[PDB]
Write a protein that binds this ligand. Sequence first.
Ligand SMILES: Nc1ncnc2c1ncn2[C@@H]1O[C@H](COP(=O)(O)OP(=O)(O)OP(=O)(O)O)[C@@H](O)[C@H]1O
Ligand SMILES: O=C([O-])CC(=O)C(=O)O
Ligand SMILES: [Mg+2]
Ligand SMILES: [Mn+2]
Length: 526
Amino acid sequence: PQELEAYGISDVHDIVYNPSYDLLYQEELDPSLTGYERGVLTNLGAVAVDTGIFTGRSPKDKYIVRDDTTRDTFWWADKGKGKNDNKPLSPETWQHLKGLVTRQLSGKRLFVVDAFCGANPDTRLSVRFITEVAWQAHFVKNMFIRPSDEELAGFKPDFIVMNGAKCTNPQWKEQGLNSENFVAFNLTERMQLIGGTWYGGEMKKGMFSMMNYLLPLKGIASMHCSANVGEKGDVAVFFGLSGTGKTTLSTDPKRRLIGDDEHGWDDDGVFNFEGGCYAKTIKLSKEAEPEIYNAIRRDALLENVTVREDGTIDFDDGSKTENTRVSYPIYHIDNIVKPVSKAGHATKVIFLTADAFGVLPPVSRLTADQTQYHFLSGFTAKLAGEPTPTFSACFGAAFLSLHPTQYAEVLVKRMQAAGAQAYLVNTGWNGTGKRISIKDTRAIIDAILNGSLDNAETFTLPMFNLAIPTELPGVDTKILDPRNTYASPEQWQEKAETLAKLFIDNFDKYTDTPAGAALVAAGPKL
Ligand SMILES: Nc1ncnc2c1ncn2[C@@H]1O[C@H](COP(=O)(O)OP(=O)(O)OP(=O)(O)O)[C@@H](O)[C@H]1O
Ligand SMILES: O=C([O-])CC(=O)C(=O)O
Ligand SMILES: [Mg+2]
Ligand SMILES: [Mn+2]
C-alpha cells in the first residue's frame, strides 16, 4: 500500500496480490464488468476476452529512454545502424508518461503479479506486474514463471511493469511521439509503462526485449525460438518470425517441450524465459494440433476469437483479427521438461520461414556461412493481397535491444562449442500457391532430428545454393525440390531471381565489415 505509493501509485484501497487462478476466473466472468474487461466462458472451459482496439503489438509506439545507461549500448532507431523500433525517449517525457500511468492506477483496485522472466535464478529478472484488468494479470500469470511460496516470501523486484492500458497521452504531438499510445522502457528506473493498448503481448515482448538487452552483454545468447528435447537428450531450437511454426512445430508428442518462444543459451545450455505458451488459434484444427487444442481449458485465456451464443468457438473466424491467440500455463502441455524449463546445449538449429514467393525448398542443411547469412537476413514473406517480404534480423528484430551482429556472434559461439548444425525450413508456400501441410512439415522436422537428413543424398539448388535431399523418410518426394511444384523449372527461376535480389539488397547493410562482406558469397547469387 505504501509500497505502491513508493512507485508513485496512491490511494490504492483494494490490493490483489498474487491472484489465484480461481479468483482470476471469477473476476473475468463477473456479470457486472463492462467493455474490454469482460470475459465469456466457452464450451472448452476456458475464458475468452477481447483485447480491444489493439489485437497485436504496436511497434510504432515503442520507446526506450536514451540516458547515460543506454546511450552507447542500445541499438537505436535513429543512429543509422539499420532499421528498428528502439526509438529514443527523453527522461522528461518518460516522467510525463509515468505520471499518466501511476495516476490511472491510483484509486483503483490493483492486481499485483510477481513472476520471473528466465528459468535460472542466476540471470532471471524478478518482475512485478501492476494492472487494473483481471485478464491482464491472468495473461502474466500464464506467460511468466510463477514463483514458489518460498520465492514469493523473499521476492525483490528487479523490474516493474505498470500497465495503464486505460489511459492515453494527450501531449504526444507536443512530445514528438507516434500516437496517444505508448510502450516505453526505462533501463535506469527498470520499468516498462504501457498506455492506451490493452494488448498483453506488450508485457511478454517487453520483458523479452529487456532480456535481449541484458543477456548478450554477459555472453548469453538471447533467442526468438522454440525449443524441445528428445528422450535421447538431443536439444533442438527453432527460430522464425511470427506465424512461421515455432509454437506449432515444437509441440511434438514424441519430444519434451522446453518452451515455444523465448530462450537463452548459456554455459549449461538452452533455457526458457517463460512459464506459458501463446498459441495462434486462427483456423485451429483439433486433428492437426491436438496438444495445443487440448491445452485450451479452464486457466487458458482465449483472445479475440469469435464465441457463438451457445459457448462454442468459431476458430476459423478472423474478422476481429487474424492474430487470435490462447495463452496457457506450460503444464497444460502433457510432455514438457519439468520442474525447470531448461535442457542441454542445442545440437540442431532450425530456421523456420514462411516463403510466400514459393521459391525456397521445404528443407536444406545450411553451411556455417549460410547459417549467418540467413540468421542476419531474417526472411519471411506474406500474401498481403501479393507476396510481401519481411527481412527481420535474427528472426526477431522487433525485440532486439543490441545490434543484430551481437546476437549472431553469441549464437555462433554457442553453436560452435556444441557442434550444432543449422537447417532452413520453408513452412510456407510452393508453386501450388498453397502452404505445405503441417503433416509434411512435421515429417521434415523428424528427418532433421533423427539424423535421416544429414545422411541423405543431396544436390545443390541453384541461385540460393542450398543442399536439398533427393528424398526423405515420411516426406512426399515431389515437394523436396521446389522447382517441381511449377509448370517448369523456368517459372520457379523467375521467382527465385526476384527473391534473390530482395535478399541481396537487404544484406547490403551488413557488408560494412570484413566478415559481412565475406558472407555475401554465402548469399543467393544472380
Ligand atoms: N507447414 C506448416 N508448418 C507450421 N505451421 C503451419 C503450417 N501450415 C499452416 N500452419 C499454421 O501456421 C501458424 C504457425 O503459427 P505459430 O503459432 O506456430 O508461429 P510462431 O512462429 O510460434 O509465431 P509467434 O512468434 O507470433 O509466436 C499456425 O496457425 C499453424 O496452424
Ligand atoms: O512480421 C512477422 O512476420 C513477424 C515479426 O516481425 C516478429 O516476430 O518479429
Ligand atoms: Mg508462437
Ligand atoms: Mn514470438
